[PDB]
Amino acid sequence: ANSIDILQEKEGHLDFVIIPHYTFLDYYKHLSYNSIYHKSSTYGKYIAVDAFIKKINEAYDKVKSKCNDIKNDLIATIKKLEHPTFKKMMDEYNTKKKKLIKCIKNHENDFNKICMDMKNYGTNLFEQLSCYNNNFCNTNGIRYHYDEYIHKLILSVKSKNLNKDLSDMTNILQQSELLLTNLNYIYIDTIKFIHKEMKHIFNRIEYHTKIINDKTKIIQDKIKLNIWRTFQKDELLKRILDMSNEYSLFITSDHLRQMLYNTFYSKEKHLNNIFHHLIYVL
Amino acid sequence: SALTQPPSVSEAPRRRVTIYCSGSSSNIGNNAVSWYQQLPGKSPKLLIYFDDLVTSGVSDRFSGSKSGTSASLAISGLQSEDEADYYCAAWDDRLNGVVFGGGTKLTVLGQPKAAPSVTLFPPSSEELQANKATLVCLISDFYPGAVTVAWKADSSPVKAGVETTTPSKQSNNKYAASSYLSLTPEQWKSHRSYSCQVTHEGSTVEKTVAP
Amino acid sequence: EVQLVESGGGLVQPGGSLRLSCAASGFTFNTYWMSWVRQAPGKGLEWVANIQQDGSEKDYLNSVRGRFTISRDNAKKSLYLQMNSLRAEDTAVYYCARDNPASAVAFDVWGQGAMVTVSSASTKGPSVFPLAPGGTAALGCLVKDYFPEPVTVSWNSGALTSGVHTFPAVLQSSGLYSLSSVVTVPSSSLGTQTYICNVNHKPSNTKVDKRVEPK
């Protein structure tokens, strides 16, 4: 329950991410692709690699779907709480949230089984990597995989002002708080809850933003040291594993950041609507 | 069996073959289907998994598909080397176990007729020295996997003491069988010639032994 | 490279116990689910059991629950099947298998198989007799009246290792088996190598090497 993030990107929808599994699955995807791009004759294996990863993802999602009944119960409680007795309504929110997390933990073994399959497949591909001479293995796999799978994400990140998104959220949180205090009720207890929700979401966004910024710089510097050059086989495998670690850590926070950003602004509409209702209707 | 497969399917070379695997919503409908090839006398090997993934190293002429409660295996550009038994399997939620299909034997057509290679042995120095006697008729490489075996003792039909095996698929796609005739060492000495007669495709190959 | 080798097969009396072992090599055994699959002679495949990487989850065929125990030892890279209260229907070749992907329940690696026979009949060793001879005269050995299967006859302590024909055994109306193994000697006219037949019936601990033709 410490490494589980909850997202609500759109009204009436809820999902969850077990953070170490996302990172784990993502890591072995980079490792697999690096293993097939090292030789030009194994490029065509990408169809099989894509198809295996797709099967793993569907298998993982099918395990997630087992908690759909508990999940939709929580969703309908959130709708009641966000669309205006509050202690009873909030107590039912915490208990339903607790059932969701217990449902997720009761399927850890199913989740781990699918994760171990991805690891084994990626490692089997990794183990077949060969060189013309082990004293100077090529790094074409590292270069190609970066150019075709990673570079677009680094540029998409660099094209954003993630720090400004945080200041925009902090200002929204501060101004909405100062609004509550200079007010004058079921509408008040509701606004305090969504504000508390948006505040936790914001701290999660801030957590991932810091990661993205660190990893953005780390990746861009490390990739320069690992391409258009050769390495002894032991060193090549080490750098591939290191790149795949950086990539997966970057991709997890980037992924979660976007989903959390959407959740924050999905909640803000409720906040704004309940404020406009407390003023113009009442 | 929970999964239903045709007992046999057949097709000429260069063509495409389909083998269905009929199941239910508790097995195929909800779980991943695997497919296996078992060559005569060999351990099985995995062809297809996750319904339609081709295991690494397996030829691309093998493909998988599944829809609803039925799965299927396709073999294109058929080769006589593809002659084997094919099994489907999948997890079953109601049984909490793997259900296997009953298997399907694949027969590739247009295989040229092949006459049996027959070898007949008389009772050994030992066995005779050990108060015993048996005739060994070894039959191999007959493509049409059917043979009739007759035994003769100085041209008289032998109706007792004969045990013949069912024909068996060799690695080379042809068949093998063996026929045995048991006798007392006095019986082997009492006759001049013993004959093993193997009939295949209306033609008869004969082998004879003498004490 | 990747290999699975079974041991521990043989003849057991009904209601008796037998333990199969599987030595794995060429891969990280500790990171995979492992399995047992069986095939009765002339019959189809029937799954027996699965076991998780650390042994915390075990799955069994309905008909063997309570009687069979699948276990593993990752340090020894070994898989086990403790078979208790054996029944005649348990008679089959038992294959050790790797379950990968385990989410797909796929047996991606198979062993050579271990023969297990559940019978009230007793083990009988065979009387191995040599077989006397297009310019390629042939000959071999005769493995007479044994029980149960299998019987292995190689020509490694001899020669023509690849070009032999070991015929499937006949099941006589006595319940005993008999097989013959012949090799098509390429140089056969008053000219040959030191060919020897290596017949060993393991359930009867018979190991007879018969050098049918020293020449």
Numbering used by the authors:
A (entry chain A): 158 to 241, 299 to 398, 404 to 501
B (entry chain C): 2 to 212
C (entry chain B): 1 to 133, 140 to 221
Paper text:
PfRH5 is the best understood component of PfPCRCR and interacts with human membrane protein complexes containing the erythrocyte receptor basigin. Antibodies which target PfRH5 are highly effective at preventing erythrocyte invasion and the most potent growth-inhibitory antibodies bind a single epitope. Here we use structure-guided approaches to design a small synthetic immunogen, RH5-34EM which recapitulates this epitope. Structural biology and biophysics demonstrate that RH5-34EM is correctly folded and binds neutralising monoclonal antibodies with nanomolar affinity.
